[PDB]
Amino acid sequence: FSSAFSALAETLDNQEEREKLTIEPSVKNQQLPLTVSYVGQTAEGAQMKLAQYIQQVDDKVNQELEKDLKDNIALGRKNLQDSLRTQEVVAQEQKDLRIRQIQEALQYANQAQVTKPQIQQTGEDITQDTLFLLGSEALESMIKHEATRPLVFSPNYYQTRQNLLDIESLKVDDLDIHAYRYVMKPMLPIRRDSP
Amino acid sequence: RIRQIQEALQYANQAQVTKPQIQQTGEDITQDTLFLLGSEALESMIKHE
Amino acid sequence: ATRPLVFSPNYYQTRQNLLDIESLKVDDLDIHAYRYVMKPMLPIRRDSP
């Protein structure tokens, strides 16, 4: 705001008749509160003109941010719909290895003659070596029904899937941006400055 | 999880596991060892979906 | 010789980091090194003489 209000201050000196309009910090040490001003020709006509020029810069900043957020959200859900496609092909390179681990464990369970499952339980996922204890019959169905076996997804996938539904749900039209706050409404003066 | 159960009914239909063979599980049951719950107990996890 | 290798979860991180570096496109990527807060004016009062 303070750089777009001082950029309105320099396009009002390019009028045929100049209109002075300034902006400055209030006390000479800290940055804000800022102190805008304007000189006119009447008491009423220099307060109406200042409250118009505050709303003119405010409607330029507020439209340069709803336009900026729409180019950030519609591009932010493109780097997430891509990051769910490259994270799914990794999740099928793990599935194509799990079918290959099962396809080797059918050869171990065909020589050791394990047909019915000998596993009573497993407290974790079954590794490569102890995979043949599921049986010769139950491992022949994990290869026959291979293309319909569902993928498994890491908990980082469901984090960036929930991060895409959060970026698709927020709305910028009803979102209100305000770049400034009145601590003093624009006054109308009693004593003129000249003559 | 319904799709993991729906595939594990096909494994437990060929291996002929009807009654549950699991005595316990110290964690959640994964995709591979899900067919040990049985053919009968996995037909009710799909009917009551 | 047909027994499959097992890969650490740092391998599948840097495998997913290669598919992310092969998928991004620089032709449709727009870079802007500046932003107008004031369009270039045309002056009314000259400077000299």
Residue numbers in the entry:
A (entry chain A): 99 to 293
B (entry chain B): 196 to 244
C (entry chain H): 245 to 293
Quote the original article.
Since an octameric complex is clearly visible in the unsymmetrized map, 8-fold (C8) symmetry was applied which led to a marked improvement in overall resolution to 3.0 Å. The high quality of the map allowed ~95% of the amino acid sequence to be unambiguously built, revealing structural details of the transmembrane and cytoplasmic domains as well as a highly conserved proline-rich segment proximal to the C-terminal transmembrane helix. Herein, the loop is positioned on the inside of the cavity and extends to the center of the periplasmic domain in a similar conformation as seen in the structure of a Salmonella typhimurium/Shigella flexneri WzzB chimera. While the first two prolines of this motif are seen in the trans conformation, P293 is best modeled in the cis-conformation in the density of our structure. The cis-conformation of the ω torsion angle of proline 293 creates a unique kink in this linker region thus helping to direct the C-terminal transmembrane helix into position. In the octameric assembly, the 2-helix bundles are ~32 Å apart (when measured from center to center) and do not interact with one another. Within each bundle their closest interactions are at their cross-point, which perhaps not surprisingly, coincides with the conserved GXXXG motif that has been found in ~50% of all α-helical membrane proteins and is suggested to be involved in helix-helix packing. Each of the pillars is tilted slightly inward toward the center of the chamber, reducing the inner diameter from ~75 Å on the periplasmic side to ~64 Å on the cytoplasmic side and the outer diameter from ~100 Å on the periplasmic side to ~83 Å on the cytoplasmic side. However, at the N-terminal end of the protein, a short amphipathic helix (α0) runs parallel to the membrane and interacts with TM2 of its helix bundle as well as with TM2 of the neighboring protomer, which curves slightly toward α0.
Polysaccharide co-polymerases are a large family of membrane proteins that play an essential role in regulating the length distribution of the synthesized polysaccharide chain by interacting with the membrane-bound polymerase Wzy as it assembles the growing Oag or ECA polysaccharide of the LPS. Key to the Wzy-dependent pathway is the polysaccharide co-polymerase Wzz that is known to homo-oligomerize into a unique bell-shaped structure. As well as being assembled into bell-shaped structures common features include a membrane topology consisting of an N (TM1) and C (TM2) terminal transmembrane helix, an elongated periplasmic α-helical domain containing a predicted coiled-coil region and conserved sequence motifs such as a Proline-rich segment proximal to TM2 and a glycine-rich segment within TM2. With that in mind, we determined and herby report the structure of a fully intact example polysaccharide co-polymerase, WzzB, from E. coli by cryo-electron microscopy to an overall resolution of 3.0 Å.
